Design a protein around this ligand. Structure first.
Ligand code: ATP
Ligand code: ATP
Ligand code: ATP
Ligand code: ATP
Ligand code: CL
Ligand code: CL
Ligand code: MG
Ligand code: MG
Ligand code: MG
Ligand code: MG
Lengths: 268, 245, 245, 268, 245, 245
């Protein structure tokens, strides 16, 4: 197992060759932004609710950036569901719907960014994310739009044309790519329940669970849907995520302080 | 019902990066064959990456970089192959176009001219999936996602070999490698061992909505691409498991 | 003298966002009618925003945001309607183009293909005028500014109603609403009450240099757009107060 | 008057409906950059004059950014008048002339930005202005090009093809959009006079005046032209502006300190 | 061997900024002549900068700015002349395209339409060469680099004078200025004194691979551009010292 | 060596006269399918004669007329079917052209428009061969002679049956008729019994120089012509016995 042996396989075999795959897996592992936390602010669960949900979270973001480095991604929400409904009724494929959804997450990032601008926190994007390093170094936070960039190359789900990789997946993959220390999803329920809590009671709260236990329990729908949970099981750097209720004052602050509010979902 | 076809008259042709790596000896005959195809088909010609992506993988892995760093670095090399091939076809009205343009303005560009060239890699950038240290969604995979999303009339994969064999015909076990004229993606996905196509190609074929078969042909033999674009069986057919409407 | 006409042969068609909001039931017939118009006219098809801009106004106003924040948020929704409509016409060679391209390269795009789709909102961005908390320069206004700047042969506004009435025919006073086959912009500007067109449209008609009349027609009735593009009177004519040269 | 009542009108009425318009007017009012000042550096009146005008103002900008947050926009000036003359003689419309003028203001912003670069102050632009928050937070100043982005969608004047909304209007509208605390126009005269001072004397200096008084006085031409003055009367956040002579050493510094140099023009 | 020609059928025409500076009196006849050339040739029309670049040089030099600052400021003025000229030809399907588009997508744009307009300045930006405080690679130089890189059929330089003289025919020594019907770049490069073309043009002609001659003609005389594009001798021929293949 | 291909990018499609005989019920779906093929292929659409040629044979034989009299009388009916089909495609730019024009100016007509319609009968007139009282060189034969002379990319024969069977599937022995997915012309020429194609077609396939296979497909099933033009196997393949170059 040498660097010369890896380079020799990389020149002589297909990238599909299991021997090459395994030598590449022994490569060193550099974390690009190891001290940062990725947070997703929900689109339907938070930003679509307006000032009563958003303003307290802006206050928490401003207080947090003193001790914490934050990459803050936005969900899409009800305008994307409207676009998906129109487009799906026309027979358009998942790759066309994917671009429509990104425009809604971009709107939400612009609105959140305008509330944060006087604190120096910018909105960033483009295929390079090139404004992230300097912003994180100087003001300890940046806002980005949460949809992945796949556009027409979006992988479809097994059934239907709704893009399976949306803003939960987009934020998760950025945490995984940057090697961040923590991934927090900010939604509108306290965490995972054995049923979903909006449509049934004696749903029981679950403080901690693995992805395999969620599948084996048959936990369907749920506050995080399965495409992001499968990415989590494959991840190299981010091997658990926390889901918290952003409508509860101070929940994001407390999660960033290491309090176990919400549900922790582990890859294994 | 399945989604509509956006560009049902389009033919997509993916040119392997290792065909381009052979230089003028392979590229000039191929350019001449493409020139003769322009009056017969409406073509989206997509290039893969080839050996330079192996070199940037070697450097990036030695530096410890994650798979979301390596994916756009390889995609860059496919873009460069595309610029080279389009330059050779410039006098026929052919240019290279970038990802945003392919995603949103391909229809107008194919109205302006008979063919355009693009990158076969998808714009997964830093959002490539984790699990392997090698980016999974590469040139075969990107070209198939686009062809199927468009509902194109076909996708032909142009390689430096006759098709798929039971073992790498340039590798250690090349002696027991036997040619497969036809296979299914599900049969290929159950095998272990290297293939001339991305393994993620088999996964996106399982969720495909339009393209029923993809042919892999040897672009080092003049005439095979021409024949494949007419449906003639001259390499390996891969059945996707899309069932007819 | 008045400025020259840049694209005197162009026909501009603005599609109301609320027509798009009706989904396939309204869009499929309209796409079929547009398809049949492509061999007859050179078309710039511009989409408005519809109900999703009302939702983002609701959120942005609840957050306190100023009118220069809300204008590009609504313009985004018109862009999405444009991407949807162009996707349906992709197989005819039609794509969506963005504001910079409309401003500077429309002539070459209309040489490449019979029609292009764009956003009807203007790129006023954070430089929208103050006074109302609702952005004044919206889809009707942007489409008219462009049509008149180009010196186009016409502008037709395609709505979910027959034309202008004396009161909102879907609103509280719908019982006393009477249809207006013809009006002048100056007469409309002196009225109070809602209209199916932006009030800023009336202001830019007062300074217009070329377009003498704009017809508002019901795009939910197949054939009315076709007739309007031939000058037939099938909805409400708005006289701009441009006098012939 | 509720948030539910506003949302109900927004769904059911035309945006032209006076009842909707009035409910939207009762919305809360968020100022995005309330502590910033917008300054316009004149194109014909300052930058076209070269080093003797520009270098002292660069010094004042560098000194000011210690206590003041500045958005610094540039005028266009004599090259834009040349372009307008060529284009108007060909019969081209106001929307074509508007793009020509923006290129000249962009040139002037690049020249000013190069003199400020060693102090860390960047030139910013693009439809998002996305470099503004971080720059203002860290170096307290940014340079931008003063023309509005209307391009071919520029509203024409009642007569002629000269764009009516140029760099005075462009800078003003950004101050208004960001909710800035102050708007200062830096030109080459001490302020407003009863005549314009370059072409007649016993012109009397006017320290303070409302827009209505300017119209009623018949003050025509003038150091600010009427399109920006009408925007001022409609503004929500910036209800007065100050015009100062940037050729006088320290005038910008003194205006930023609250001294009443120049002319104050009030919306009412 | 020499490199291949990318666009051998292309004709490149550089329009001097000082021709544009004369306004409608010079531009309208020239636009009419270009209109009549569109069915005869495939044209890349590139504009120079003219007097406004002198003004921005005056300001930028008074501010002390280096040559890499002044080069893009002058290139901006050539871009504005290009937007003006394209606007006048918009009704013929002609648009202005920017540097990235000229570099990479010219072939598809010339398939869409008969002519496109661009800037004649090259994108040297802050990487202009040092030595003079005046940017050396200006409009004549950029247009020749592009024409020769493309392997175009010709480059014609359209000026406000009949051609090259032995002294500036509008300058102090205008009395002893005699017209040169033909010269070589090497002979011109050995002379001192002003020319109607960039001195860097002579340097890039020495390294040229395809263009054998460039004609400088008076665009204020209707018909001379038309004649030059047919090879007729109506101004000054500059031989580049490329030898035939 | 074999002769060059004159129009290698052409697709030839022969429409059986008995498909046309079914009227609107068969023709409208077929016209819709052809409409969708125009952006994908360059088509020469040739019509056969159908039942009216049987009637004129009945009259002409009762009058005693020789085979050189009956050949142009049948060819007239194929021409009328061609005029009907072209009228249905006129709005797509499609016209019928006569024999002299097909022989000499097809290239320019296929540059003008995406498809043209002609008669599938050859102009043998009073020079038809003797031996049978029924003209031997009919619509299948004429269409194949033209396709092979042009060196076209294919010839597809569109019939009112799925393909060739071992007996007439509409005739007396229809019970023992079994479908043949693939056959050779030489095997068919050795059989006795009726076929859905002219027997002279088999003879001209024996002397053919370019076309290797001809597919016979059911034009009463939407989609089969589209699939056949892509090389998909959906009817009977006839191998001609041309060997690849
Ligand atoms: N089972 C197999 N059958 C055929 N070829 C195989 C097989 N396994 C490995 N290979 C190898 O795959 C090679 C092609 O390498 P690769 O497929 O990466 O090139 P490419 O497709 O040109 O590159 P890119 O994916 O960047 O376009 C063949 O030359 C062959 O040696
Ligand atoms: N006087 C009037 N006459 C006709 N319609 C009116 C009048 N007043 C209000 N309306 C309303 O205007 C509605 C159209 O809503 P609106 O005009 O905003 O939609 P749109 O034009 O499709 O949206 P967009 O402006 O984003 O394109 C009509 O359905 C009608 O109810
Ligand atoms: N030897 C010469 N022969 C001809 N003209 C000369 C000579 N020396 C100087 N000139 C001058 O060059 C002038 C052209 O100025 P210049 O060449 O810069 O304009 P331009 O080419 O239109 O500008 P740009 O280079 O921006 O396109 C002529 O009008 C003439 O006065
Ligand atoms: N062995 C066979 N297999 C298939 N069809 C056969 C066979 N023998 C006879 N037929 C008949 O041929 C018929 C077609 O008649 P014919 O082929 O003359 O029509 P057509 O090709 O439409 O006419 P035209 O030759 O004028 O274009 C079929 O409907 C079928 O009944
Ligand atoms: Cl705050
Ligand atoms: Cl300094
Ligand atoms: Mg491969
Ligand atoms: Mg409306
Ligand atoms: Mg010159
Ligand atoms: Mg038959």
């Amino acid at each position: 197992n040498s660097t010369a042996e890896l380079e020799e396989l990389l020149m002589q075999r297909s990238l599909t060759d299991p021997q090459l795959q395994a030598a590449a897996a022994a490569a060193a592992d550099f974390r690009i932004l190891p001290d940062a936390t990725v947070i997703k602010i929900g689109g339907q669960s938070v930003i679509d609710r307006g000032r009563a949900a958003v303003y307290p979270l802006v206050d928490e973001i401003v207080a947090a950036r003193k001790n914490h480095k934050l990459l803050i991604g936005t969900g899409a929400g009800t305008r994307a569901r409207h676009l998906y409904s129109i487009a799906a009724g026309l027979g358009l494929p998942a790759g066309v719907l994917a671009q429509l959804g990104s425009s809604v997450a971009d709107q939400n990032a612009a609105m959140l960014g305008q509330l944060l601008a006087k604190h120096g926190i910018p909105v960033v994007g483009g295929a390079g994310l090139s404004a992230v390093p300097l912003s994180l170094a100087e003001v300890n936070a940046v806002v980005f739009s949460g949809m992945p960039p796949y556009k027409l190359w979006m992988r479809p789900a097994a059934e239907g044309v709704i893009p399976p990789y949306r803003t939960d997946a987009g934020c998760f993959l950025l945490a995984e790519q940057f090697g961040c220390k923590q991934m927090i999803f900010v939604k509108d329920e306290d965490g995972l329940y054995t049923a979903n809590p909006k449509t049934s009671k004696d749903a029981t709260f679950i403080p901690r669970i693995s992805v395999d236990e969620m599948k084996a329990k048959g936990l369907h729908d749920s506050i995080l849907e399965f495409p992001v949970l499968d990415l989590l099981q494959s991840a190299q750097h981010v091997r658990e995520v926390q889901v918290v209720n952003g409508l509860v004052p101070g929940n994001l602050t407390r999660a960033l302080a290491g309090e176990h509010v919400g549900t922790i979902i582990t890859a294994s | 019902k399945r989604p509509i076809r956006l560009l049902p008259w389009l033919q997509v042709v993916k040119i392997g990066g290792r065909v381009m790596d052979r230089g003028a000896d392979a590229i000039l005959p191929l350019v001449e064959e493409l020139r003769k195809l322009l009056p017969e088909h409406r073509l989206l010609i997509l290039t893969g990456a080839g050996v330079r992506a192996r070199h940037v993988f070697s450097v990036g892995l030695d530096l410890g970089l994650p798979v979301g760093s390596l994916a756009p670095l390889a995609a860059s090399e496919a873009g460069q192959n595309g610029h080279i091939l389009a330059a050779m076809l410039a006098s026929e009205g052919v240019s290279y176009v970038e990802h945003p343009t392919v995603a949103d303005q391909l229809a107008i560009h194919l109205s302006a001219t008979r063919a355009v060239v693009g990158s076969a890699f998808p714009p997964y950038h830093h959002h490539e999936f984790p699990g392997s240290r090698i980016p999974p969604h590469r040139a075969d995979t990107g070209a198939f996602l686009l062809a199927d999303a468009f509902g194109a009339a076909g996708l032909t994969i142009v390689e430096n070999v006759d098709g798929i064999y039971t073992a790498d015909p340039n590798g250690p076990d090349r002696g027991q490698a036997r040619f497969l004229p036809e296979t299914s993606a599900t049969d290929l996905a159950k095998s272990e061992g290297p293939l001339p196509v991305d393994r993620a190609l088999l996964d996106v074929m399982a969720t495909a909505r339009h393209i029923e078969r993809v042919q892999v042909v040897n672009g080092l033999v003049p005439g095979r691409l021409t024949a494949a674009l007419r449906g003639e069986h001259v390499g390996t057919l891969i059945r996707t498991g899309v069932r007819p409407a």
